[PDB]
């Protein structure tokens, strides 16, 4: 053994550097097993339910392909007709569904609800995700930094550029800290993680040899790094008429061929957990491009970087499937 | 043999006490087979279609898990985009779909349509359900009364409290009558099954030794019973402003710790084919709780009974999966 | 070998009479394999994604049953929540999805998009269909004409009646031309395929011995044919108030028992790639029947032909599943 | 273990209430295993021989189907050409046949011969039966009384009506006595089992709580019983001209709707180990009906009971197959 | 699907040209599957009973080999000791036997009895045959005409010579009519099918393009046909002393090398559903040969045709096994 | 290879000492394979037909068990209803039966018929036997002499006592001659094999080192032999009243404890291909015992030898099954 058999993965802020390393070694070896055809199905006859409150195709397909490779079966239950709070309640419908399913994947907004599901279901609940966010895109990215750089975890350094609050900034700092990598965040001080959370990331960062800068100067943050990360900072919905101040703020932190070449090294790569606003060929992306001519070519990533080889965003998007398979196999599988 | 191979289960009012007993022995033994891992897949390579006109997750998941345990495969076809009466017609689309599928599950409102499907499809049609209602929650409940009480079918007595017209009242009386159990209904006379149907249930009740009371006095109806059943009587939609008279009527028939203790026996259990309005933690359930302070704690079941061990509603909800598996295995399977 | 392993079928206007014959021999033999139980699963452990921009149940079920018989697994991705052009772009989401899936089925309006998918996905893309339309209902129909008539392809003649522009008219002429059958189109000259396309169909028609008439006289077109084809010519949406001129035009081309008996032969059959407006028992079909009393019994096919044995429309509808299985097995399968 | 591996079942008058209960639990569970498809073949590669001196189709088919479900193979050897006493001798041909077969089924008249076979064969000999009669219709019937009444063995009571000497009367009293059921025999005193055998059945009846009446009054015997048993009392052959006195004797003991309603209870059932003279539609049954107009509608069972739902004679006839399978699996099978 | 799952084949005068074509395509493909070793067993663990009232080896062996290739198991029950009408009744013994078997094959004289069996058994009853006769030698012969001529069904013409009343004459006309072949009967007018049956065969013959002559002139009937059929017209039993008038009647209709060469074509073949009186080397055939010197070389077929290559009677006799396998696989098998 | 694949064994007088040795090594090793459970089934999916004109249970069971161990399937066709010469002819029914079966076993009187079967069937014909007699009891006995004595074939000597004409006498001399054993026949000169056949057995006896005496003195013939053989010499049927001269002739050649002790050696064994008239406990054996008091204890073998350990007649009777399995596996099996 040395197992985490039956453990929910409902978003963990709590996990040994030892469990996190077990979980990434297992996804590394399950990726290699698929490719080589050495993969054996250890979830045959297991049926999982997938309750998604927001539609999220890339996370549904990752659960669906991972569950299927391992012989499991999947019931996708929508946003359109899982009228959850309507007339039923997560507590009452998790109790019915842990009686028919073997594990449950959840993806909604309100992490508070994930906890009811996890509490009452009676069977592994895997938070695919919520706002509070992601355990698995966390381990997908570091699975990606590790296989591509071909260096031990602790000789990988990377930077995150701007709005380290929309929490890909927090989740990258959290895992760089527990695994002892060299993580640098580059955002304007109004947008750093709140300092009690950086205080935690420093508690962690000390037990491992982790280095954490937090600057506001991109060219610095990104110096000699392997892997530059960014993420869409404009909030679709807070209308659009005048993203203007937000756009004036983060537009220095635009990952672009100056920032990429600004890193020291010809092997630095760009990563982004998609969708990336990187040109006008989308309907959101023509709106913005009208009201802002100088975007219309990439808001937080320019096409001059997105569509040419600094970009491993799709190999990283795939790696999210090999991680959810690491989570279904150490929770469920007969090993 | 002794089979009902190829027989549609499209809602049967017609079935031998002998077929009903075959069908409950088979679900009893298929439940035990899952648990023990003695279950063999006898529907491998069978694909069933599931046309649902109203969304019903608990009945979709029961079809889906049952079909999957037995190696079958399922195509779920929505309410959103099975524009059935629109430009096609059940008669024309059942003829196309019996050519690609092996059996079809249906769940719509209008039992009249189930019959077209059953008539023209060319392949087993299983009425998951309609308004005319349920063959399988009928056999799920008596599968539940029988395994929990550990008594022969004929030494199980149970009561149904109020609005024995919204037909869980009819379906419980119908099957208590054919299997010779002791079934008591407790509702105000304006809400009894119409008497030609009780006349039928008495025809039946005589061939078996079945006892049928129909009172309006709860404490009587429920005396010395095993299993007390109820069901939501407020009709979501007939607006809400003033359920008042309905609420003044059925509120004496509220299953609650007086009614439960009112039964004679410390082993009586409560059953309900979910959703049960049993507190305000739902959005329908905050509406009502505002307009009616004295509900806001359970309309037809109080939380003082729902959330503490008189309640086997979830073991009964699971038992609906082991019954639909009894119906796919005696219709389809190679045995 | 002699394979088309890895070849996308994204709608081919380009294909050898040799590949088309390989593809119909394979669906013929895969139909027979299912029926006889000689079918072996050669797609086990293959997962395909099905992105449908318009809901199309009959084409989803054909992909779903074909993929399943062969052991594959299917992720259906809706119209409701594949907000494709919204904030992502086919080019970016095909690159993510060819990393998790093994092949992709597509069905949208805009053939232009199918090409992005096919270009960037990295894995077989099968156009289930678009407006530009169908490779597989093309081979389903000729699979149907060939097995039912029991004659070699070149001794099958058939007619298409009216509006040979709504392209079932073009696709029937295209394949009658490449396979050397005797194809006759019967429509008013304002509605013939545009003559540069008939010029192509004649280039083709010469290399094979194909005969192509194009008349405006039904009784002529249909003389001594095996198989009479038609299709709904009223465009649901271009309002309805006054289909009148369209209805006055094509109403001579109504396939009906005069046209069917007008063929020479007691074995002529009617075919139609469903839905067929053939009576009022539908909600579109009561609208029209009100505004047009003399339809209300079949717009392009009368019930006097649709519902009685000249009609093989459902055996042809099934044959669409055995063709998509011929396309998944020569693209994907390990043979 | 706890096995009776290798034990002949050549008709046992000697068997623990413990072995008899093992043998009926095993046939109960092997019935359920067939129905559920949980049955595994534990006699693969075992060949049994079936020497039948009188033709008996219902007992051959029960051996044949039971042996086959379990993967064994069967050689049926006739009455027509097993000229046994002719020029060979059971002792000499059992020694040859235990060298080629794995077990032997026997059915002849003379129980004395069964013993030679059992003594010299060298391999399990299962007495299918002789005049001395049946071990397996004994356990088939009580397997039937037990599953149908759904009561523990000791709360089942039953009656046998008239000629408790033609030994279905003895075999029912013998097993009611060892298993502690409530067995009542109803026959005229000239036709009771001989009293030293009732003395044995009382020795037995005391160790278990068994009640044994022996009356001559049907309406009494049958009072409040579950299951009324009878059997053909006219001996085909002792000519026919004048069965008259026999017919005047047992004709009060005719099971008929007075006797069936005479039992207390609406669930009493009739059982009979077929053939049952129950009407004239047979050639023996037209003979008798001529010489006796008032029979010609059922000699020991009237059609008014045989052909309408008090009659479980065919479910009991099937249960004879699940018992012979309990006997081949505890003798032979690798468990 | 498109199945006839569970359908008895107890002799059908009622069957779609569509079911008959399904049934012959399936036997065609099951013949090819045996030869090629592509055959999979889809009746494993199915046991069928074969009640034969007249001994018929060629029909027993065809059931037995077909049932065995598909993994089923067979209990043959004789004429010698199935004393059916004796003391039991088909209605009572079918109810016992549908409880142990999975399907039942029957072959007796009295079609009236087949119907009781089919009505009460509870499991597929396949009429192997009766006097009313054969569904399967009907489809064996047309399976034979179709594979040997290599022409579509409708380009096969054949003739039947004399005594088109002994119903091979009726069954050949019936199926030539439903499948649209060109069927000619050649018998003296006293021996034509009775005209209300030819009136039926003409109803049928019109919906398909079937041609039916009925002449009394052999050389005409047989002109340019593929396949000449005949059958023994002397009734063994209506003594023998003086078959004389029968022999003077049908002796012009003797299929012989004049009639065979009288057909137009060097590929015409002779067919006969054996036994064929075609020489004296039999004990019936020496009797007749004495009393009739000029027979003694072939009564309805001369040895000059029977024993030299116009004769496909044995390939047709085999084809009766591949048809009964088409009937066990579409009734029983898990496909 | 080195095979006799497809070779009929229809009784061979022609066979290399090399094929006979191959055939006995193979039955030796197939006996050992059964016992050890090293036996693999190499006849799976092979069906053989068994046409028996005289009933012969011991030879049917040997074919049946051998065919079954190897996965084959068997159709037994009787004497009662294979009315062979009646109205059909071996030549015509072998042609039908080689089309459905894979090999055919035959056992009739008239070896002349075996040859028609073998000539026309088209598939291996194994003469189980005829009057002309046995290839397999020949190799069963020498398989028995060889395993029991544990000596090489050529150091086994044996004697046959009286009526070396009823051809067990010829078949023992024939095989002792080809395999070079020491074979002695002991019968009165009126009953020796006819001398042209002994002339053949001497041709043979010289190429191998075979010794052949033919004496009329038992005590001599049997001196120092291993294995003493005899066989019933009274012909049941040539009435019985006065077997007297036959009984006075062969009664000196009675194998009995004088003859057995008369051999030199304490390991000599008696063999007999059963039935052996060895006492009165049979109905033929009480007839004779009345008319001949001094028999009534064993005509050609006395019970003082038959029923006590000089007697290996039943191990030899079993060995007939392991030989017919050597013949089905070298003819049919995929090795």
Swiss-Prot record, chains A, B, C, D, E, F:
Pathway: Amino-acid degradation; L-arginine degradation via ADI pathway; carbamoyl phosphate from L-arginine: step 2/2
Disulfide bonds: none
Catalytic activities: carbamoyl phosphate + L-ornithine = L-citrulline + phosphate + H(+)
Signals that turn on the gene: During limiting aeration and in the presence of arginine.
Subunit organization: Nonameric or dodecamer (tetramer of trimers).
Extra facts: Proceeds by an ordered sequential mechanism with CP identified as the initial reactant.
PANTHER family for the chain: ORNITHINE CARBAMOYLTRANSFERASE, ORNITHINE CARBAMOYLTRANSFERASE, MITOCHONDRIAL
Similarity comment: Belongs to the aspartate/ornithine carbamoyltransferase superfamily. OTCase family.
Name of the featured protein: Ornithine carbamoyltransferase, catabolic
Provenance organism: Pseudomonas aeruginosa (strain ATCC 15692 / DSM 22644 / CIP 104116 / JCM 14847 / LMG 12228 / 1C / PRS 101 / PAO1)
């Amino acid at each position: 053994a040395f197992n985490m058999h039956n453990r929910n993965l409902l978003s963990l802020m709590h996990h040994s550097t030892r469990e996190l390393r077990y979980l990434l070694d297992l996804s590394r070896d399950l990726k290699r097993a698929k490719y080589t055809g050495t993969e054996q199905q250890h979830l045959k006859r297991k049926n999982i339910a997938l309750i998604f409150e927001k539609t999220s195709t890339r996370t549904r397909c990752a659960f669906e392909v991972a569950a299927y490779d391992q012989g499991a079966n999947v019931t996708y239950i929508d946003p359109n007709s899982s009228q959850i709070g309507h007339k039923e309640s997560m507590k009452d419908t998790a109790r019915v569904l842990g009686r028919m399913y073997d594990a449950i994947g959840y993806r909604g907004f309100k992490q508070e609800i994930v906890e009811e599901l996890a509490k009452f279901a009676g069977v592994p609940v895997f938070n695919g995700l919520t706002d509070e966010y992601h355990p698995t895109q966390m381990l997908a990215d570091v699975l990606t930094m590790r296989e591509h750089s071909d260096k031990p975890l602790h000789d990988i350094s990377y930077a995150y550029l701007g709005d380290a609050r929309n929490n890909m900034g927090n989740s990258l700092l959290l895992i760089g800290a527990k695994l002892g990598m060299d993580v640098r965040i580059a955002a304007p001080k109004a947008l750093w993680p709140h300092d009690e959370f950086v205080a935690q990331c420093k508690k962690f960062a000390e037990e491992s040899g982790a280095k954490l800068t937090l600057t506001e100067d991109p060219k610095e943050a990104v110096k000699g790094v392997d892997f530059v990360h960014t993420d869409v900072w404009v909030s679709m919905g807070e209308p659009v008429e005048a993203w203007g101040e937000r756009i004036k703020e983060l537009l220095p932190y635009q990952v672009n061929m100056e920032i990429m070449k600004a890193t020291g090294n010809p092997r630095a790569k760009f990563m982004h957990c998609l969708p990336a606003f990187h040109n006008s060929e989308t309907k959101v992306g023509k709106q913005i491009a009208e009201q802002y001519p100088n975007l219309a070519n990439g808001i937080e990533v320019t096409e001059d970087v997105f569509e040419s080889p600094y970009n491993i965003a799709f190999e990283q998007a795939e790696n999210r499937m090999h991680t959810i398979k690491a989570i279904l196999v150490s929770t469920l599988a007969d090993i």
